[PDB]
Structure formats: C-alpha cells, structure tokens
Design a protein around this ligand. Structure first.
Ligand code: MEV
Length: 390
C-alpha cells in the first residue's frame, strides 16, 4: 500500500450561548458548535524533521528530530497522577526556544508542548518525522473558537499518529464518510486540546475545547459535560465587530473586578450560572423550532446575560450597538466569548427565521454599520477524521 502515512482531521468553531467568563469560576455554560471548521493534514516525512505551516498565520516552521529528542529526554511525566495542569518549566523552555520566529508564538509553544508530552507518554524518546499543514474557516480575531479548533485538530492528529488512540472503520462510527472517535477517545482528545488552550490563555475553562471536540450542544461546568443537542433548534446570527481583543486582557478585567468588588461581581457570576441552568433545561426538554413563547424566554435569558456581562466590564461600544440594534428589530443580542471586541450573537425569533426579507433587513443594517453578519450553522459534528484521496 502506501509508503507515506497521511492523516486528515477537522474540528468546528463555536459560540457560547450562556456562561462565558462565569464558567472560568466554576459556573455553568451552554455552548454550540458551528459549521465553520479548522482543517489539518499530517503526513509522514523522511527528512528527520518536524514541521508546521498554517494558512494566513504561520510560514513553514520546523525543528530537527534530534533537537526535539533532547527536549523529550529532559521532560518528566507523572506516572501516578495525570497532569491536569501545565508543566510551567517546559512551557518557559519552549517559549524561549520559539521567541526568535518571524498569537503565533503561543501556537508554536502549544504544538511543541503536546508533541513532546505525547511522545514521553507513549515511550518514544524521538519524535517521528512529520509535516503538519493547517487551514481554517474561523477568523482568529472573531472569538468563534479558532484556538480551540486548532488545539483539537493537533490533539486528535497527534494522538492517532503516535498510536495512542486507534480509530478504525471498526473502532469508530461513520458520519458522511468521516470517522467519529469513541467516547473514551473524545475525552483524551479533549484533555490534550485543553492543555494547548491553557498555554494560549492560562485560566481557560475548557468549555471551548470541549464543545469543539464533542460538537452539538453542551452544558458544561468545571470540566464536566452534558450533551443537550436533542432539543430546541435555535437560529443565530453572528455579527463580527472587526475589533480584535486579547482574551487574556478580558479575563484579567473580570479577575480584577472580582477582587475589587467581591459582593457585586460574585453574585453577578451566580446570576449568570442561573441563566445557564435555566437555558439548559429549556433547550433540553424542547424539540423542534421554538414557539413564540419559548423564544421570548430564550430572548429574555440572552438580554439578561448581556446585561450581566456588561456589568463585568467585558462589553464594547460596538457590541453594545449590535445588541441595541438587535432589540430594535425585536431580537436578542449578546457578546459571545471573551468580549471587548469579537462577535455578538443575535438569537432570531420564529418569523425572522421563516422570512428572508426580515433576515435580510437586519443583515443589511449590520452591513450598513460596517459589521460582518454571518448566519450560524448549529448542531454539527465535533472533531472528525477524514479519508485522504490519493
Ligand atoms: C471568556 C471565556 O469564558 C470564554 C472564551 O471563549 C474563557 C473560557 O471559558 O475559557
């Protein structure tokens, strides 16, 4: 058969309907996967190098198998307690090693970290000679799960290539010719993706990598997960502010306001938690398109959450304008993700969903204000393995 092994994986982007920022402090979130996907090819090579390239983000970047073997030699793994948190020393070593290149630095660190750690875990003292090529539909500046989808693609591709998971046409199930990893495989994919996400933003909740891994609709709290996609089907318009914002700064804002105003900020986080719980029950127990009644509750939950997020100081004038506009059209808007920029989501009422002209009006308004509207596809699959023609 083939001289050169070749793997292909994809992972979806995401929105958070409820519980961003709160989820960092052990509260509940509700998150949904998108039709926007990150795509990764990994092939065998014979040059004794490891390389990564990513469209519109990273030029060809490589290391010798020799240099990385020396890192693997000095790396430690706990044989008794699975590393739930980062080996900060390796991270700094890797950061030092990659500072010379011309969030692309943390992407490289994240890659090397799980590569080295997965080799150590699997008892390889030397990494295999490989090339990785990545592309995405997900903009980095949008807060739609760019980094998570990248993390998940790396995790699944490396776990499989190094033989730590074996995903066969017997072991795994088929969706439209693609393979879905098993439950156990999904957990392990998710774990190593989480480690990458922690390098990108230290106090990531793990909701992002979890929804990217598993796909569909999830209720998430403190790295524990419930699938809830077998319920109401929402219609959501994504609206990008074109404002780019560091996630870490937004997290810092909330961490600070929590120290400064404990008796305000903490009850606000609890209120968000309650919104997420209520939402999760509405979505779970319903079926089909929301009625007018169900939509009004859903819209109310969205507006309450945007208000509470604004209270945490993580909104932005342009996010505000988007949500205010949503309200003028009878809709309900909130930021999704880190805030301070990025995207809002506008949950659409039953009419706006049936009738194109309604949808087109709101869309044209957001365009007139120089935002990019994009109608979300929801409920799609999580990480997938693909067959490679040729
Ligand atoms: C702001 C936040 O809640 C969502 C990031 O999209 C951070 C996290 O949960 O990792």
């Amino acid at each position: 058969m083939s001289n050169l092994r070749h793997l292909r994986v994809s992972a979806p982007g995401k929105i958070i309907l409820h519980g961003e920022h709160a989820v960092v402090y052990q509260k509940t979130a509700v998150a949904l996967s998108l039709g926007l996907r990150t795509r990764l090819d990994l092939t065998e090579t014979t040059d004794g190098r490891i390389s990564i390239i990513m469209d519109k983000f990273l030029q060809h970047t490589s290391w010798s198998v020799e240099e990385l073997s020396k890192i693997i030699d000095k790396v430690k793994i706990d044989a008794n307690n699975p590393e739930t948190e980062l080996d900060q020393e390796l991270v700094e070593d890797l950061r030092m090693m990659t500072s010379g290149h011309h969030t692309q630095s943390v992407a490289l660190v994240g890659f090397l970290y799980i590569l080295v750690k997965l080799c150590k875990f699997s008892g390889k003292q030397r990494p295999p000679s490989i090339q990785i090529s990545i592309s995405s539909d997900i903009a980095i500046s949008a807060g739609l799960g760019s980094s998570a989808a990248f993390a998940v693609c790396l995790s699944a591709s490396l776990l499989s290539y190094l033989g730590i998971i074996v995903c066969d046409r017997k072991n795994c199930a088929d969706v439209d010719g693609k393979l879905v990893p098993s439950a156990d495989q999904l957990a392990l994919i998710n774990h190593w993706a989480f480690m990458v996400e922690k390098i990108v933003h230290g106090s990531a909740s793990g909701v992002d990598n979890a929804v990217s891994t598993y796909g569909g609709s999830i209720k998430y709290r403190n790295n524990e997960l419930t699938r809830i996609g077998s319920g109401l089907k929402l219609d959501v318009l994504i609206v990008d502010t074109h404002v780019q914002r560091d996630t870490k700064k937004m997290l810092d804002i909330v961490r600070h306001r929590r120290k400064l105003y404990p008796a305000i900020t903490n009850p606000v986080l609890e209120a968000i938690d309650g919104i997420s719980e209520t939402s999760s029950k509405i979505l779970q127990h319903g079926d089909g398109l929301p009625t007018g009644e169900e939509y009004e509750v859903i819209a109310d939950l969205v507006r309450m959450n945007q208000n509470l997020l604004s209270t945490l100081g993580v909104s932005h004038p342009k996010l505000d304008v988007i949500c205010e506009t949503a309200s003028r059209f009878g809709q309900a808007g909130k930021l999704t993700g880190a805030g301070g920029g990025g995207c809002a989501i506008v949950v659409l009422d039953p009419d706006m969903r049936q009738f194109e002209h309604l949808r087109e009006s709101i869309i044209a308004e957001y365009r007139r204000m120089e935002f990019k509207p994009h109608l979300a596809e929801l409920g799609g699959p999580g990480v997938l393995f693909h067959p490679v023609p040729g």
